[PDB]
Ligand binder design. Structure first.
Ligand SMILES: CC[C@H](CO)Nc1nc(NCCCc2ccccc2)c2ncn(C(C)C)c2n1
Lengths: 248, 826, 325
């Protein structure tokens, strides 16, 4: 019926890019750069947050089936965003994505787009669609962050602080392979869990079951804390590796 | 775009309705006979009929009634067309000048309504206060007949009874009263309402409702001396007036459905009834005058008079002369004698009026080697069925060959100097367990005879029970001599086998010329037949020999010879068969994308398939590969009646809505999609039902005649008897004639003031489109009948194109020449 | 697996014929070589390379892979032309969207004039159609092109909705700017004729009501060529858009512009007196001018007409195949 789009962390060591000789760190750097390229380009074009994420998910899934050494990352990204626009009904013309890409990319980087940027991108759409197996509908952590936050009742300001911090964590997670490991519902919970831990908020008190210390179980059944701790760890690693710190 | 020309070679011959009255003068008795689109006015004399006037109307005549409102000297004529054009007409004669006055007119169509199953019913008041129209289910339309209603404005009254069979205005009521038989789940019933013009609604009726026979079909309004109404069914005749209820159930009328009625004696003492096996009855009202000064109905009696043609309408002429208006056979004038003849009949035929009847199929053959060509039609149905030989000898010479059974398909086999004709006759389940024919006929009067002994379906094990009295069709192939039209041979097909298709041809390397018939096993239980045969016969030395049989899993609706192979249409499948050296049929290739492959025509390696609902599809045989290919389809959905190929690019088709269309290849190779789309480039409302298209012309050619501007010749036969010719035009000639039509339409006065452009507009219940790509030849040919002043008005400011002179003015005499050349095509 | 779409080749189908001319490519009828199933392939041409894969096809793929209901056409898979090997840039082959093959279409059955619908057929017909629309509406999807051509019927009596090329998701909490001219003129709701954007899912209900009446009359209700003439016909029957029946009509772009000849009174119940009382109520409520007063899909299924219709007893429409013969 519908395809399985989630792999285990251990499986990411056997991605095509890795097996052609890319070291793990480099594939991750390419994944962030490609995702952030998609984010930056779409933001300049005014795109909805769902459109940006859908492109990034297409992108991340793509390089589970193909290698970075044979398919250039900035070209793929532009293609993903181009298709994501059509899927999420926020369409853009390919020439406008190329233009925006030129502004944000170096000459070396834009070299990947070659002599005819639009052509390289429009030609890749055929492969992209077959790679993602025409599973075009994608759900993102954002809708669950809001759906779950709406059922919290309490200090308006503490909950809004929780949501915004968690929302930032969602945006940051798009740079990682978490999109390929855990359903979005879990991600939304994990970022709520992280924002709470950092703000010293006890979310159970805002739920309809205030003495149910594992507040997530009423939103997402069957999620071990281990999963939530792993996701949290992976998110904070991005902050510790970079120069940026937790938003608070 | 495409340009075509349509002319009528023989006008409708079928009588659709007849009324008697005082229309031309308050003094004369008239017979107004109605054929589709044509009104014929006769005056009744010592001779049966004196013809006085004939007019054409731009509409199908659906209601025709005569009424004489207070203040008029003579009867006025009401006509409603099938497109809901209404008018009131008056006859006016000034010495030698005869013209028809349009006194009132309008279109009574409603924006919202469901058309009724039993059709448009039109009735007029006894006092001529109102005209009632039953157009839609659940609604009764009233046109009040006031002096001021020159536009025939009308209003609807809500009718609770949705399903009405027949309604007639009743005589002898304090206020206008409608008597109608209706159907609801509990059976059929007779009810009465009253109609209030002041309140514009129905009020309670004079006499109660009664549940009536389930097959009650007609309401007769009994005149004032007797009062009440008579309801005719299949088994019984019933009279209802207030509390009085009379019911006669003669054993004679159960035999055949009664379809027409007319009043013999004005007081209502005697009525004429007719049925479909041609029997003519006399309904008698037995007076019972009581000493109280009242006249009451004693009993109802039915007396068999004799045999007439299967009658659509009966009209009694004054002095024992009856006019038999027939749609399935020749119309007639019969005399009812007081004394029976030695055979027991009181009916003796006087005159016979030719009716080409339903033309089920026809072929053009040059029987005398003249290069003129004759037209042989399958005409009539049941006892009135016949072949007709038609040649353009201006009138046409017509020979009639009675068959007394229904002809279905015809094809000529020159090698054998004879015709093959498929026919079916009606037998009835009898006490023996078999069936008995009601009358001798062609398939029983053949010189030699044979019966299929095929074992193909003999395994049966499928039960089909028979009840005494039920009808069955028995199908036959007839071998008929081309000079004498003697039935030389009759071959009877299997029980429940229907012959649907017939061809005469050679196949493959086989030098023998065969008759090939396609059949279907028709059982009442089946929605679509699932068994069938293709049978190869050889007519040799006065005997038909069965050469080979091929079983198929459907009905072979149509077969056509395809470059030495047999093209066949097993419902939903188009198949090409090869004829082997072992004299058996072998399948080569198939096409399966159809709903029902009813009609097939071919040209070269192209095939035009006509579908039940999917219009027309151009196929091609790709000899290099040995299979078919879909060239293009007409994607607009149309119900088909017949198709014909005009040329390699233009295709003709006829709809069950009485419409014609021509589809052309889009002739654009830019996209594959454009190539595969046949686009309707011609649309035309003919007004007749086309059963058969046939390439040919009856025009006598000695080679001295120059080619007319029209190129090509397709003849077509219709159900109302009309014959027509479709021919192509150059762009230049079309535009001249089209521009001339628009000029003629402004000049020529229409009966009922019906717009010609409206009449020819493509019309289905759902859609109405202006006509395109077709020149109404009959309108063009009426230029020669309009007055000279009108001729100059028509040719004023008329220019030519694509000629020696780019713009050239037309003279009236020049157009008189052009039209006269066009009158030669037919 | 069954989910790995876009790789299987169209070789696996025997093309039988061209059933129709579609928006983005022509639909062909085909037989599966392995199973014998009859399918309908909708060809997708991305060889144009104007702006790639058509968005109409993207919507039909995105939406139908989510929607599973007896009355919603199913996309079985997506297959491709023989693709060029190792040269993805040169490849210009097309994709085919595989669907279940439906024998007839409501317009084709009606244009032939062959089918006669009894009240009990119209009940089985509309119950399926409105139950399907309910499924789509509960999932926040709008069809936006409900016409006779898009309603597919089998000889068995099963009804499925089909051309979702113009369908998009609707969130009630957020009013979103939309394309105002989205439905076929004959079935267009009054709000879209008067220029309404941010339209409700009730636009589809109006279309289904037009069909409801068309099944009883056998002829479309509002037949016009121009947007103004259409508003006139609707107004002759339903009443002129006026402030009383449609309070917010004054907010629509063209209300002052597109006035009908008169301020007509509603006659729907009079001109449709022949319709059964149960249905005439359904028609009256489905063809209500104000989108806020027009019934929902669920309300039609909880109506005296369609509620007690047992769906197991699907009734085949009166198909007169032997008539013409
Ligand atoms: C979306 C509707 C259009 C137009 O009818 N096309 C359409 N017509 C389908 N059947 C109709 C078959 C008609 C036909 C039958 C035989 C020969 C010629 C024509 C059909 N069955 C499934 N689909 C999906 C691809 C939506 C369909 N699409």
């Amino acid at each position: 019926t519908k395809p399985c789009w989630y792999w285990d962390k251990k499986d990411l060591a056997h991605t095509p890019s890795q097996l052609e000789g890319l070291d793990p760190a480099t594939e991750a750097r390419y994944r962030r750069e490609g995702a952030r390229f998609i984010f930056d380009v779409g933001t300049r074009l005014g795109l909805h947050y769902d459109t940006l994420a859908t492109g990034i998910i297409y992108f991340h899934r793509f390089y589970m089936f193909h290698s970075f050494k044979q398919f250039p990352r900035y070209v793929t990204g532009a293609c993903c965003l181009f298709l994501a626009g059509k899927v999420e009904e926020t369409p853009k013309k390919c020439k406008d994505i190329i233009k925006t890409a030129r502004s944000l990319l170096n000459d070396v980087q834009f070299g990947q787009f070659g002599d005819d940027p639009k052509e390289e991108v429009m030609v890749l759409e055929r492969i992209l669609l077959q790679t993602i197996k025409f599973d075009l509908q994608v759900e993102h952590p954002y809708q669950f962050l809001l759906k779950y936050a709406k059922q919290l009742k309490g200090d308006k300001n503490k909950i809004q602080k929780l949501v915004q911090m968690a929302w930032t964590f969602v945006n940051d997670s798009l740079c990682t392979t978490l999109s390929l490991q855990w359903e979005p519902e879990i991600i939304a919970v994990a970022v709520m869990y992280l924002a709470g831990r950092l703000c010293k908020f006890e979310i159970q008190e805002w739920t309809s079951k205030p003495m149910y210390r594992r507040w997530w179980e009423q939103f997402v059944q069957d999620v071990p804390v281990d999963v939530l701790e792993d996701i949290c760890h992976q998110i904070l690693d991005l902050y510790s590796q970079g120069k940026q710190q937790m938003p608070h | 775009m495409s340009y075509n020309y349509v002319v009528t070679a023989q006008k409708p011959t079928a009588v659709n309705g007849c009324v008697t009255g005082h229309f031309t003068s308050a003094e004369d008795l008239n017979l107004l006979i109605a054929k589709n689109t044509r009104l014929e006015i006769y005056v009744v004399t010592a001779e049966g009929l004196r013809p006085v006037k004939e007019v054409g109307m731009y509409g199908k005549i659906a209601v025709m009634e005569l009424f004489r409102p207070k203040g008029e000297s003579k009867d006025l004529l009401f006509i409603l067309t099938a497109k809901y054009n209404a008018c009131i007409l008056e006859y006016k004669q000034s010495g030698e000048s005869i013209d028809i006055i349009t006194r009132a007119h309008g279109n009574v169509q409603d924006r919202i309504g469901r058309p009724s199953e039993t059709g448009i019913i039109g009735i007029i008041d006894p006092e001529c206060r109102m005209i009632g129209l039953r157009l839609y289910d659940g609604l009764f339309k009233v046109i009040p007949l006031d002096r001021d209603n020159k536009e025939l404005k009308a209003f609807n009254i809500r009718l609770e009874e949705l399903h009405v069979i027949d309604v007639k205005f009743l005589y002898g009521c304090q206020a206008p009263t409608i008597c109608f038989v209706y159907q609801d789940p509990q059976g059929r019933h007779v009810k009465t309402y009253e109609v209030s013009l002041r309140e514009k609604e129905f009020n309670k009726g004079p006499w109660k409702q009664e549940n009536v026979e389930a097959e009650a079909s007609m309401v007769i309004a009994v005149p004032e001396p007797f009062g009440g109404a008579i309801i005719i069914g299949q088994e019984s005749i019933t009279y209802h007036n207030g509390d009085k209820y009379l019911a006669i159930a003669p054993p004679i009328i159960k035999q055949s459905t009664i379809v027409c009625h007319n009043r013999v004696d004005p007081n209502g003492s005697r009525y004429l009834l007719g049925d479909m096996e041609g029997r003519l009855f006399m309904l008698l009202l037995e007076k019972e005058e009581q000493m109280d000064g009242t006249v009451t109905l004693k009993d109802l009696r039915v007396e068999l008079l004799g045999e007439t043609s299967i009658a659509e309408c009966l009209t009694y002429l004054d002095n024992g002369v009856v006019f038999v208006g027939s749609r399935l056979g020749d119309s007639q004038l019969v005399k009812l004698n007081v004394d029976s003849n030695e055979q027991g009949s009181y009916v003796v035929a006087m005159e016979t009026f030719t009716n080409l009847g339903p033309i089920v199929d026809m072929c053009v053959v040059d029987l005398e080697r003249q290069g003129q060509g004759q037209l042989v039609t399958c005409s009539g149905a049941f006892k009135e069925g016949s072949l007709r030989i038609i040649r353009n000898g201006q009138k046409l010479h017509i020979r009639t060959v009675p068959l007394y059974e229904s002809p279905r398909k015809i094809c000529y086999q020159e090698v054998s100097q004879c015709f093959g004709v498929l026919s079916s006759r009606i037998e009835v389940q009898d006490t023996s367990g078999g069936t008995t024919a009601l009358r001798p006929s062609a398939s029983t009067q053949a010189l030699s005879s044979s019966v299929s002994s095929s074992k193909l379906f003999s395994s049966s094990t499928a039960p089909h029970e028979t009840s005494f009295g039920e009808e069955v069709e028995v199908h036959n192939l007839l071998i008929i001599d081309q000079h004498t039209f003697e039935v030389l041979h009759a071959h009877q097909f299997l029980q429940n086998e229907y012959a649907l298709s017939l061809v005469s041809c050679k196949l493959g390397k086989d030098p023998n010329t065969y008759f090939i018939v396609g059949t279907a096993m028709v059982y009442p239980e089946e929605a679509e037949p699932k068994q069938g045969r293709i049978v190869v016969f050889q007519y040799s030395d006065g005997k038909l020999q069965t050469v080979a049989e091929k079983e198929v899993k459907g009905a072979v609706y149509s077969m056509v010879e395809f470059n030495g192979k047999l093209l066949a249409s097993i419902n939903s499948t188009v198949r090409l068969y090869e004829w082997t050296t072992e004299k058996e049929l072998r399948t080569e290739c198939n096409h399966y994308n159809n709903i029902m492959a009813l009609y097939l025509k071919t040209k070269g390696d192209f095939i035009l398939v006509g579908d039940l609902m999917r219009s027309v599809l151009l196929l091609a045989y790709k000899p290099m590969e040995g299979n078919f290919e879909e060239i293009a389809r007409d994607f607009n959905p149309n119900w088909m009646s017949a198709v014909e190929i005009l040329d390699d690019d233009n295709f003709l088709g006829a709809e069950n809505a009485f419409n014609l269309f021509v589809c052309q290849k889009d002739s654009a190779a830019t996209t594959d999609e454009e190539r595969q789309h046949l686009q309707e480039v011609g649309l035309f409302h003919l007004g007749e039902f086309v059963n058969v298209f046939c390439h040919g012309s009856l025009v006598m050619q000695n080679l001295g005649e120059t080619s007319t501007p029209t190129q090509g010749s397709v003849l077509f036969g219709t159900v109302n008897g009309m014959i027509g010719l479709v021919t192509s035009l150059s762009e230049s000639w079309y535009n001249l004639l089209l521009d001339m039509q628009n000029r003629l339409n402004k000049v020529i006065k229409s009966v009922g003031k019906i717009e010609h452009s409206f009449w020819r507009s493509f019309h289905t219940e759902r859609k109405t489109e202006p006509a395109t790509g077709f020149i109404d030849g009959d309108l063009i040919e009426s230029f020669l009948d309009i007055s000279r002043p009108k001729m100059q008005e028509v040719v004023a400011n008329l220019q030519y194109d694509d000629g020696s002179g780019m713009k050239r003015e037309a003279t009236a005499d020049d157009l008189i020449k052009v039209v006269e050349e066009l009158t030669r095509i037919h | 697996t069954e989910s790995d779409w876009g790789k299987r080749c169209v070789d696996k189908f025997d093309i039988i014929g061209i059933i129709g001319e579609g928006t983005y490519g022509q639909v062909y009828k085909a037989k599966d070589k392995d199973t014998g199933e009859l399918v309908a392939l909708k060809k997708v041409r991305l060889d144009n390379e104007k702006e790639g894969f058509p968005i109409t096809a993207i919507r039909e793929i995105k939406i139908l892979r989510q929607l599973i209901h007896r009355s919603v056409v199913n996309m079985k898979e997506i297959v491709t032309d023989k693709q060029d090997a190792l040269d993805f840039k040169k490849d210009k082959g097309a994709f085919y969207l595989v669907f279940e093959y439906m024998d007839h279409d409501l317009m084709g059955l009606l244009e032939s004039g062959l089918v006669h619908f009894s009240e009990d057929h119209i009940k089985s017909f509309m119950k399926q159609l409105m139950e399907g629309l309910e499924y789509c509406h509960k999932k926040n999807f709008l069809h936006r092109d409900i016409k006779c051509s898009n309603i597919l019927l089998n000889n068995s009596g099963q009804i499925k909705l089909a051309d979702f090329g113009l369908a998009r998701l609707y969130n009630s909490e957020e009013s979103r700017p939309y394309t105002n001219k989205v439905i076929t003129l004959w079935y267009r709701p009054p709000e879209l004729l008067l220029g309404e954007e941010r339209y409700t899912p009730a636009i589809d209900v109006w279309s289904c009501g037009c069909i409801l009446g068309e099944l009883f009359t056998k002829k479309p209700i509002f037949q016009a060529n121009l947007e103004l003439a259409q508003l006139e016909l609707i107004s002759r029957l339903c009443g002129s858009p006026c402030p009383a029946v449609w309070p917010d009509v004054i907010r629509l772009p063209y209300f002052n512009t597109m006035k009908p000849k008169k301020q007509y009174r509603r006659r729907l119940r009079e001109e449709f007196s022949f319709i059964p009382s149960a249905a005439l109520d359904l028609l009256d409520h489905m063809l209500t001018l104000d989108p806020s007063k027009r019934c929902t899909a669920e309300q039609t299924l909880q109506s005296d007409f369609l509620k007690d219709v047992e769906l197991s007893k699907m009734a085949p429409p009166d198909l007169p195949h032997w008539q013409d013969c």
